[PDB]
Amino acid sequence: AKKKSKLEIIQAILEACKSGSPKTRIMYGANLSYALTGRYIKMLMDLEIIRQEGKQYMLTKKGEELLEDIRKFNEMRKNMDQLKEKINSVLSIRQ
Amino acid sequence: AKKKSKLEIIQAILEACKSGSPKTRIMYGANLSYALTGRYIKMLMDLEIIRQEGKQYMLTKKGEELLEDIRKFNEMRKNMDQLKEKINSVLSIRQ
Numbered sequence A, B: 001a002k003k004k005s006k007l008e009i010i011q012a013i014l015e016a017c018k019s020g021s022p023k024t025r026i027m028y029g030a031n032l033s034y035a036l037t038g039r040y041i042k043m044l045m046d047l048e049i050i051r052q053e054g055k056q057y058m059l060t061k062k063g064e065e066l067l068e069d070i071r072k073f074n075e076m077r078k079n080m081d082q083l084k085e086k087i088n089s090v091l092s093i094r095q
Helices: A008-017 A023-027 A034-046 A061-091 B008-017 B023-027 B034-046 B061-090
Strands: A050-053 A056-059 B050-053 B056-059
Touching: A008 A023, A008 A034, A008 A050, A008 A056, A008 A061, A023 A034, A034 A050, A056 A061, A061 B061, B008 B023, B008 B034, B008 B050, B008 B056, B008 B061, B023 B034, B034 B050, B056 B061
Parallel strands: none
Antiparallel strands: A050 A056, B050 B056
């Protein structure tokens, strides 16, 4: 089932950096794939989302603005599916 | 491209019935597949969405409540996609 390895686990990496935290503090977010996960942190660094604070991972202006963006989407996407379900309900689809 | 024959054209059938209107007044909504479109009116009628007013098609309590539901979804779905685009923008996907 798709839901991690890019969407959730990553969100945990961005949230862990929301205040400067080493790779270890990210485990408290989810099982650290450290062998591979380093690929996610490096990605968020290469793309400009995480920041280096004393060799620690912190959030850059881009990372905070992204945290809010992801919030709304999930807050609206769930609304869409919720609303979508309301459409099939009254519309029944085909009874 | 999917966008009618079920989502838009139908919406026009719901809006046309928003005030009792014959099958002809619905043509002003689209190229009316009248030969087949009748299948859409009956479908919405059989599912409890259209209403028969003097042989004309009107909106039933279910049809009005559905009109608003479809509005929100589309108003939130576009938000999700707009927001989604914001995610790939700052997350720059993979540059």
